[PDB]
Amino acid sequence: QRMEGGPAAVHYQPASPPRDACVYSSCYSEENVWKLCEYIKNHDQYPLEECYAVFISNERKMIPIWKQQARPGDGPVIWDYHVVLLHVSSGGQSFIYDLDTVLPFPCLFDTYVEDAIKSDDDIHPQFRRKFRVICADSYLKNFASDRSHMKDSSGNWREPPPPYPCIETGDSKMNLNDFISMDPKVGWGAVYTLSEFTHRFGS
Numbered sequence: 308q309r310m311e312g313g314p315a316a317v318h319y320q321p322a323s324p325p326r327d328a329c330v331y332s333s334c335y336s337e338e339n340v341w342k343l344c345e346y347i348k349n350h351d352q353y354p355l356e357e358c359y360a361v362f363i364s365n366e367r368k369m370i371p372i373w374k375q376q377a378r379p380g381d382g383p384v385i386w387d388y389h390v391v392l393l394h395v396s397s398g399g400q401s402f403i404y405d406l407d408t409v410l411p412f413p414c415l416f417d418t419y420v421e422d423a424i425k426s427d428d429d430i431h432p433q434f435r436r437k438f439r440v441i442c443a444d445s446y447l448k449n450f451a452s453d454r455s456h457m458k459d460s461s462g463n464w465r466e467p468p469p470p471y472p473c474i475e476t477g478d479s480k481m482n483l484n485d486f487i488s489m490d491p492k493v494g495w496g497a498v499y500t501l502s503e504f505t506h507r508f509g510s
Contacts, residue, residue, distance in 0.1 A: 313510070314398035319413075322346075322353050322394050323404055326412040332469040333377070334457070336390040337362075337483065339406050341450055341474055343392045344443040357395055358443035359496075360450075362486050363424075363436050364388035370436050374410045374423045385434075388487045391419075393440070393508060401508040420505050427501045437489035438504040441496030449495050450486065451479040 323329060323343055330342040340360050348355050363370050364387070371383035378384045392404035394413070401416030408414065408423060427435040441449075453473050457465050473480070485494035499507065 311510075314400070316396045316398055316400040316402075319396060319400070319402065320352070321413055322350070322358065322402075323392075323413070326406060329406055330469070330471075331406045332467070333407075334466040335454075335469050336407060337388075337450070337452060337486065338469050338474065340390045340392050340404075341446065343404055344447050347443060348447060353394065355444045355447075356442065357397070359393040359395070360441045360443060360446040360486075361391050361393050362388055362439040362441075362489075363391070364439075364487050364489055365433075365435060365437050366489065367433050368487065369434055371425075371430070371434055372407075372423055373425060374408050376407050376409055379409065392443075395508060400510070416509055420509060424501070424505075436501055438499040438501070439486060439489060439494065439496050440499060440504070440507075441486070445495050449476065449478070449482070451475045451481055452483045453481045455481060456483060 323346060331339055344358060344360065347353060347358055368387040370386050370389065372386060372389055373383045375384040394402045394404065396402065402413040403416055403419040404413045406412065410419060410422060424436065451474060454468055457468065459465060488494055489498050491498040
């Protein structure tokens with residue numbers, strides 16, 4: 308026997324609708340997470356300060372993620388970047404909302420790290436993961452994307468765009484590179500190593 312123990316939110320209520328009821332577009336995870344942040348803001352359930360947009364990438368923009376819908380099985384998808392929502396519940400128990408995972412929606416942090424992320428120990432160093440964590444309030448206020456990165460040079464869509472107008476602010480219409488970048492000298496939020504990330508939010 309082992310005691311898995313602070314306070315565990317055993318009665319946790321999701322901050323989102325059911326997976327299938329959520330606004331989702333394949334290859335637009337930055338916008339899928341943005342829409343979850345907007346839903347949490349307009350819903351009177353959880354404070355926005357408890358929620359974070361998490362960008363996963365690296366210098367070479369080649370990161371493995373396991374348990375992904377786009378590739379069923381034991382092998383990973385190699386993304387240029389991926390975005391999930393992190394909810395740190397009042398007690399300190401963390402939950403991951405990833406609309407692209409075959410793990411539960413939402414999923415306990417430790418379970419998502421264990422099965423989806425795994426250790427960088429025996430991973431080829433060029434594939435190792437870094438994490439930019441942005442408060443959901445700061446993500447909604449500062450994030451802008453004109454979707455120019457999803458068009459070819461001829462101007463045709465690589466993947467069908469989301470069925471609503473481009474997200475913009477007063478300050479910018481495109482700053483997506485400042486979020487995907489894992490340079491701590493650019494952008495909003497904090498950039499973490501895997502060990503720093505798993506420690507901060509993991510039990």
